[PDB]
Write a protein that binds this ligand. Structure first.
Ligand code: HEM
Ligand SMILES: [Mg+2]
Ligand SMILES: [Mg+2]
Length: 86
């Protein structure tokens, strides 16, 4: 009864512009198209990562507990395991 959708990195890479702004962080896939102007760190750092694995950039910032919880509402799925960063 889990209802997780699994994506490949090629599928994520198709969603690579500000109007379909997806990225991967720690093997979770997020669609932040509706978050761009709500992000305290601005929209450009997020548009720069559209279609990519943004894990290292996200971690370099050291986001807070509240930012980590806020992210969950933008999760749309997870990477297929064979492409995961382990
Ligand atoms: C593309 C990956 C991301 C990058 C590069 C990024 C970058 C940044 C930057 C530069 C700041 C300003 C704070 C600082 O520089 O000290 C920031 C703050 C913040 N970001 Fe992001 N961010 C990313 C993804 C997200 C996501 C998905 C969320 C959640 C919905 C989020 C939520 C926040 C919040 C709430 C803050 C305020 C500080 C904190 O709570 O940690 N960010 N971000
Ligand atoms: Mg910059
Ligand atoms: Mg780009």
């Amino acid at each position: 009864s889990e209802d997780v959708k699994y994506f490949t990195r090629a599928e994520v890479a198709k969603n690579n512009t500000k109007d379909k702004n997806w990225f991967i962080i720690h093997n979770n896939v997020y669609d932040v198209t509706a978050f761009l102007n709500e992000h305290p760190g601005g929209e450009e750092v997020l548009i720069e990562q559209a279609g990519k694995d943004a894990t290292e950039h996200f971690e370099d910032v050291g986001h807070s507990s509240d930012a980590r919880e806020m992210m969950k509402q933008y999760k749309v799925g997870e990477l297929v395991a064979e492409e995961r960063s382990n």
